Enzyme design. Sequence first.
Site, PDB file in Angstrom:
ATOM      1  N   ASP A 155      41.565 -35.475  24.409  1.00  0.00           N
ATOM      2  CA  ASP A 155      40.420 -35.367  23.481  1.00  0.00           C
ATOM      3  C   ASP A 155      39.424 -36.476  23.804  1.00  0.00           C
ATOM      4  O   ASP A 155      39.840 -37.588  24.197  1.00  0.00           O
ATOM      5  CB  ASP A 155      40.878 -35.376  22.023  1.00  0.00           C
ATOM      6  CG  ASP A 155      39.748 -35.065  21.062  1.00  0.00           C
ATOM      7  OD1 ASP A 155      38.993 -34.108  21.336  1.00  0.00           O
ATOM      8  OD2 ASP A 155      39.600 -35.805  20.072  1.00  0.00           O
ATOM      9  N   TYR A 209      31.435 -40.751  22.690  1.00  0.00           N
ATOM     10  CA  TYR A 209      32.427 -41.826  22.983  1.00  0.00           C
ATOM     11  C   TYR A 209      31.980 -42.606  24.228  1.00  0.00           C
ATOM     12  O   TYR A 209      31.969 -42.033  25.347  1.00  0.00           O
ATOM     13  CB  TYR A 209      33.845 -41.282  23.191  1.00  0.00           C
ATOM     14  CG  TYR A 209      34.530 -40.678  21.988  1.00  0.00           C
ATOM     15  CD1 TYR A 209      35.717 -39.978  22.145  1.00  0.00           C
ATOM     16  CD2 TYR A 209      34.011 -40.784  20.705  1.00  0.00           C
ATOM     17  CE1 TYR A 209      36.374 -39.404  21.066  1.00  0.00           C
ATOM     18  CE2 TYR A 209      34.658 -40.220  19.613  1.00  0.00           C
ATOM     19  CZ  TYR A 209      35.844 -39.525  19.795  1.00  0.00           C
ATOM     20  OH  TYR A 209      36.488 -38.957  18.731  1.00  0.00           O
TER      21      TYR A 209
END
Lengths: 302, 302, 302, 302
Positions: free
Chosen positions: C44, C49
Amino acid sequence: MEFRSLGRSGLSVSEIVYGNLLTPDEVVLSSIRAALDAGVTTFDTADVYGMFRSESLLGRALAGTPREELVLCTKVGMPTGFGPNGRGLSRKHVMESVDGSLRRLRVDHIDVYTAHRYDPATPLEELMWTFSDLVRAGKILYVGMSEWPVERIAEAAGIGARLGVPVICHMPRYSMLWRAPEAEVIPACRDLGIGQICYFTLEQGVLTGKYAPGAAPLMRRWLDDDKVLGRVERLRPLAEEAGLTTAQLALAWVLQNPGVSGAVIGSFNAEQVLANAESAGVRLETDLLVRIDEVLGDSVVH
Amino acid sequence: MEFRSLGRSGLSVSEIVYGNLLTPDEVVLSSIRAALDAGVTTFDTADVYGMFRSESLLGRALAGTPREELVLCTKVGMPTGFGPNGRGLSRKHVMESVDGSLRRLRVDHIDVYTAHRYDPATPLEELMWTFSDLVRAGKILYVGMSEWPVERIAEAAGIGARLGVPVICHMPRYSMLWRAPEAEVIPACRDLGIGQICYFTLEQGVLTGKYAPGAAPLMRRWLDDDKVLGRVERLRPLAEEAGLTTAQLALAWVLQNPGVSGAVIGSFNAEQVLANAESAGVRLETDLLVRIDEVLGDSVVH
Amino acid sequence: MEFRSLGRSGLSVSEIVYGNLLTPDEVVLSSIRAALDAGVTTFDTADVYGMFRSESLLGRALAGTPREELVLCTKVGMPTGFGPNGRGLSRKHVMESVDGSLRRLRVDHIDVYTAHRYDPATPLEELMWTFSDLVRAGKILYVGMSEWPVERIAEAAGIGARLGVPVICHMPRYSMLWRAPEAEVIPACRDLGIGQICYFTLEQGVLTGKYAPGAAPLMRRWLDDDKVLGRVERLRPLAEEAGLTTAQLALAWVLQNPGVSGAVIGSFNAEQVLANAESAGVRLETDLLVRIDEVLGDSVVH
Amino acid sequence: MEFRSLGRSGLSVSEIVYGNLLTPDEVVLSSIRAALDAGVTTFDTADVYGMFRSESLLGRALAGTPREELVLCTKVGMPTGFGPNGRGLSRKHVMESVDGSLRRLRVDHIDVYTAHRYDPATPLEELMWTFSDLVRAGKILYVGMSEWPVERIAEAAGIGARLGVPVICHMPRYSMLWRAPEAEVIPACRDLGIGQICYFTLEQGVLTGKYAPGAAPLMRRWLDDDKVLGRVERLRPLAEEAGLTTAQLALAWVLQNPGVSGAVIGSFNAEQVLANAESAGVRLETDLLVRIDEVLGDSVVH
């Protein structure tokens, strides 16, 4: 040139359509050029016409013409390959036919893709979902049918409406002599928002008035009628009174039907193409239509 | 060769189907050539057969044959990768399987994509929407299922109809000896417009009549029956009376079922392929069918 | 490794999921390698991010691993561009986000595309039709949601079912200490065929038992509780009795919920990744679960 | 800059929209640059504006700006080719228009594709299924309409909802002087989740207060009113009291309508673009709105 909506659609076709049905390459190319020069926008062909040759010649002759100025119609259904999947209207045959037609016509979409004869072996759900996939893909814009039973036209139009496949075109045999579609086909098509693009409007030369008694296959069947050629000759005075040739009168006659979008001509004589194209926008007086029926009498097929 | 509709569809398959189930490359290639020579149009394989080798050899052997002359069937569902997404009928496994099958078969579409065994872990909505996406994309034309429960066949066919996914093919085990699908599967499939393409029609050699008592896995299970090989030998007079080999009688027998579209042969002997292909179009007299049942007696599985 | 279905779907995820939330490149790459070595299949990340860095590093670390062996999950919704269309769940932002995620991950499809937080400015019809277009295109397989209101989860799942968009995944905060999703979210998701992939299972180090009283943002909020670190220390005897570390007990605890498909770990220590991965398949006795609740007492958030 | 939702959608537009309606290339390019510098995100054009020149110049001027920072709106419907398929809203014309707009704008998608005037020759099912195909293809995100009858707006919005085509934008003529859309169009659009992007907000210079009595085509019609230019001059005290130019007051006035997403400016003067952009976020006191109506009196068209 004059233009009509092809059924209940935003598509406009020229009242005269050039159909290069299959003669040397140069004769076909010069005839298509003659049609363009006459203001014809709408060209009809089929994979099966001259086995791919008709599509290839139309692709070459129309090369350079801006895409938005042309309505390109072709067909699928008649045999173009060996074996039982080389013909008909299966997802397989339709999917294996479309890219060949696009390549030969030199286009990324066909305006009108016509199902050439009804295929009792293919469920209409199978065919209409195949057409849906080709419309989604931008390979075809609008769907036509050629010489289908009226009940299958209505079924196809219904499924098309549900799937967002425009079903806008039927291609009957229709002429001053051949009026079979008036009974059921044209009425039903008008109800369903389908326009006619008419084939054999000059009955393979019979309705030109050029052929005398004792001087294709359709012309073969007409010659079983011992009076038809003599009756067509008697139209010449009627035509001349209206400032038309017999061929122009024949083409104008088909265009008097409000269910008709276009009349197909296929002449390989540049002069005839230009003359026949001038049939567009001609209104025939009711008295003229009455005595046409009197002259042709029982030669007319209802 | 003789041809049948594959269920309620416009697709035609050869009554004899060549299934190169997995032997050196040359034996497989020459057998496929023998099938083409015999007029076989319909070839079946699977990703899992010889782990991709069957698809690659079929792709090579069929290279050059016009696409419209071939019906190519392959499968997804059996393990071809490591881990729990390397098998089954998830959107993930189906989407990650199809491009490999297309590349190895050397085609841009598969005619019949068969779900190899029912996957209780995948919702049928998930699978049938994946098939919808592949039909929209033009990567597969028609959907099949292999040895599914009848209730899941009906569910899949229903969803397929709603989504415009043609569900036209079931691949049972069906032979003169193995008649389990007659009870529920063939009746339900005929109702749903699904045709059978039959596997193990020669029961891995048992129904060739070549094997004597005291002379795979299916053949292993058959040898638990101490009378079956002796009973098959007694068919030879019946076959010869009809001008057939025992193998031709076995293949003809499966084709007598109106629910059957095709019978699969997998022989690696060029002469057997050509002989077995001639089973197509053979009608068996009712009296012949009655005494076949008498000869085989309680060896038949219902 | 042990595997679970991600909701009512054919997709299988590893019970331990590696989430490289954002540290030098080499530490991230070696941690992903450690996860692969431990048998983790399910990774994931998110566009946001490390602003694209997490996706790029996962793409590099997973390069060469057979596609069918990996479940790649990423996200859209958090700000990755300037201005009001550089964030949220509009057709515009989702369509402008997906190709970047595919390029950085070095794949042609994402297994699970997660809507990162509910966007009250986007109609769910607009979002779910965008997901439909990406599923049709083969760019995403399955849809997830992260920390959504339960009513919007149910709405999305309904529209998804109608449009053939698999809605199979919710990503809550869920740990031994943070049990808010047990009241409504997990029950509703189980009803809708949605599985949980759980974030902050080790509560940013609090549930490792490594941190003593007086020795991130989530850990900041936990330190407002003057007893929580002392209570976690008292779990060590309970863990050791079951042959687990406190971290393994924490991960096993989340996996005891039948609504949970996977538990996310994000450790940058290769040894911790391998140890934490061994939490998979661990069954906790009911008596152990009772005294966990007794030890943690009123530190647990319901 | 201030931003608004474009109808009931996740799309945000700048309250000031730059519309380069068609002057030398350099003047157009520098004006677009001025708009970007002022924080304008939303640019409007049409295939027909300067016959493709407007789209090409916008494509060049916006090159390098991150795609997520821009909302690009263009149009189809006005004549851009010869003959009856060179205009209108047929599947043919829309499909033959979109790729040209994408190439000239230098993008792979248009944010808002606007149907330029209602085409009574095209069934709305034909148009809305064409828009569906372009949304599925990722070539357009959202659909607009320009100066449509309210009944056809509602019909289009209904079909759009069914087909997952976002119908979010209407482009009326709307100014302090031209209030025709307040009666039915804006109310209906608010009901249907459609926002206005307003054209002729400065009435081709009339609402700048730069033009004295006795000192575009719209300005031509305004000069039939012997009081309008004198009345606009009397707004200057009202504008100055609010710390605005007359042009800023005119733009602010349009943005006071809760049905309005954006106001279009088209100035070729860099200084005017920057000044007019500062109209965004300006709230007008109710007393100011009352005496605007008193000053303009019967010059206002309702």
